[PDB]
């Protein structure tokens, strides 16, 4: 037993991480087969970055302008092209460590693992959720761009995120691996801001189920509510609405604990209206919303990955 915010093993991704330097800019790239993917703003300099025209900037580039460092082996660039906000640098060596992989785009409310990297070298791994406002609460310093986020399904790495920038509230924005931003952001230094967030209601309920499985029961009650009456409470506390599909997703956790989904909603209602009164749930004094129902079932059952 026990419940921890848990990342996927990062080994398969570590072997894809490289260093890309163009001019005065160094960032990370993702080397799969004979292509290195990286944020397109590597072709910029500090005055290009106010309002650039990347198409104009890219035609002015040469293959030899791109220095790609795979550990201590160089990588010769033999072609380049831009796809939305990422660059595709085609190199003369296929990565012999290429795992099987997919480029997927995730939904707000879904989680993934981030391998933070600097200078092509992995630094740490941790779990993030895509917020309803398309930002992520990460840990990123200068040089971390091109770090990726991912999930692993048996042996297959599904890449879902590439890091590009930090917003003024200290949260982070990036693209999928086809170069398309999550949310209404641009890879330019403008007055960009996150915009209003909400709490991921189905995830909180999943975490409450994780708590019951692990022996935290004090917030349980005899009461029930209807989906509609719950959602008027959710609205008032800036939780997002609970759908019947969310109820269906929570079915397995309901079955395992014997606690009906709408009864857990009644428990959440009281927690929202009364607070916790000095008590904790799974070592937290806050209602946690960055664990999906899948995350709870994975950890509270022991699924592995080869």
Ligand X SMILES: *[C@H](O)[C@H](C[C@@H]1CCNC1=O)NC(=O)[C@H](CC(C)(C)C)NC(=O)OCc1ccccc1
Q: Is 50 in the site for ligand X (CB under 6 A)?
A: no
Is 145 one of the catalytic residues? yes
Q: Is 2 in the site for a second copy (CB under 8 A)?
A: yes
CA angle 35, 41, 46 (to 5 degrees): 145
In angstroms, the CA 254 to CA 88 distance is: 45
In angstroms, the CA 55 to CA 106 distance is: 28
Nearer Cβ to ligand X, position 99 or 143?
Answer: 143
Q: Is 145 in the site for ligand X (CB under 6 A)?
A: yes
Q: Is 304 in the site for ligand X (CB under 6 A)?
A: no
Which is nearest to 228 in space by CA: 237, 219, 241?
A: 241
154 conformational bin, left if phi > 0, alpha if psi -120 to 50, beta if neither: left
Residue of the chain from 165, 171, 253, 264 that contacts ligand X (CB under 6 A): 165
Chosen from a second copy, ligand X, none, partner binding at 41 (C-beta under 5 to 8 Å by type):
ligand X
Q: Which stretch binds ligand X (CB under 6 A): 72-80, 106-114, 138-146, 247-255?
A: 138-146
120 conformational bin, left if phi > 0, alpha if psi -120 to 50, beta if neither: left
Nearer Cβ to a second copy, position 26 or 225?
Answer: 26
Dig out the tokens for 60 from the structure.
């002015």
In angstroms, the CA 277 to CA 271 distance is: 9
Q: Which stretch binds ligand X (CB under 6 A): 7-15, 87-95, 143-151, 263-271?
A: 143-151
Chosen from a second copy, ligand X, none, partner binding at 49 (C-beta under 5 to 8 Å by type):
ligand X
Dig out the tokens for 198 from the structure.
């909400």
Dig out the tokens for 238 from the structure.
């800036």
Chosen from a second copy, ligand X, none, partner binding at 187 (C-beta under 5 to 8 Å by type):
ligand X
Q: Is 141 in the site for ligand X (CB under 6 A)?
A: yes
Going by their DSSP bridges, the two strands 156-166 and 100-103 should be labelled as parallel
Instruction: Collapse the DSSP code of 71 into the 3-class scheme (helix H, G, I; strand E, B; otherwise coil) and give the result.
Output: coil
**Beta bridge pairs of residue 166:** 172
Q: Which stretch binds ligand X (CB under 6 A): 61-69, 158-166, 177-185, 277-285?
A: 158-166
Q: Is 272 in the site for a second copy (CB under 8 A)?
A: no
Q: Is 112 in the site for a second copy (CB under 8 A)?
A: no
In angstroms, the CA 109 to CA 202 distance is: 9
107-129 core/surface letters (b: 16 or more CB in 10 A; e: else): ebbbbbbbbbbbbbebeebebbb
Q: Is 283 in the site for a second copy (CB under 8 A)?
A: yes
Q: Is 217 in the site for a second copy (CB under 8 A)?
A: no
Q: Which of 38, 85, 117, 145 is catalytic?
A: 145
Site size for ligand X, by CB under 6 A?
17
Footprint of a second copy on this chain (CB under 8 A)? 1-12, 14-15, 71, 115-119, 121-126, 137-144, 166, 170-172, 214-215, 280, 283-286, 298-299, 301-306
| Residues that are catalytic | 41, 145
Footprint of ligand X on this chain (CB under 6 A)? 27, 41, 44, 49, 140-145, 164-166, 172, 187-189
């Amino acid at each position: 037993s026990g419940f921890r915010k848990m990342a996927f093993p990062s080994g398969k991704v570590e072997g894809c991480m490289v260093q890309v330097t163009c001019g005065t800019t160094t960032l990370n790239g993702l080397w799969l087969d004979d292509v290195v993917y990286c944020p397109r703003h590597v072709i910029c300099t500090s005055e290009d970055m106010l309002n650039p025209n990347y198409e104009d900037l890219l035609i002015r580039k040469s293959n030899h302008n791109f220095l790609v460092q795979a550990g201590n082996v160089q990588l010769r660039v033999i072609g380049h092209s831009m796809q939305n906000c990422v660059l595709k640098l085609k190199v003369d060596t296929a990565n012999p460590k290429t795992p099987k992989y997919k480029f997927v785009r995730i939904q707000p409310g879904q989680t993934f693992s981030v391998l933070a990297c600097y200078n092509g070298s992995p630094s740490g791994v941790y779990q993030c959720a895509m917020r309803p406002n398309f930002t992520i609460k990460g840990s990123f310093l200068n040089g971390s761009c091109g770090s990726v986020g991912f999930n692993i399904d048996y042996d297959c790495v599904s890449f879902c995120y590439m890091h590009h920038m930090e917003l003024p509230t200290g949260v982070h924005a990036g693209t999928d691996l086809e170069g398309n931003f999550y949310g209404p952001f641009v890879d330019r230094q403008t007055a960009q801001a996150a915009g209003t967030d909400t709490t991921i209601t189905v995830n909180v309920l999943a975490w409450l189920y994780a708590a019951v499985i692990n022996g935290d029961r004090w917030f349980l009650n005899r009461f029930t509510t209807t989906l509609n009456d719950f959602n008027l409470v959710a609205m008032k506390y800036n939780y997002e609405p609970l759908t019947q599909d969310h109820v269906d997703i929570l079915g397995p956790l309901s079955a395992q604990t014997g606690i009906a989904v709408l009864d857990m909603c009644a428990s959440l209602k009281e927690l929202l209206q009364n607070g916790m009164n000095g008590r904790t749930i799974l070592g937290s004094a806050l209602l946690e919303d960055e664990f999906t129902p899948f995350d709870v079932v994975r950890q509270c059952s022991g699924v592995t990955f080869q």
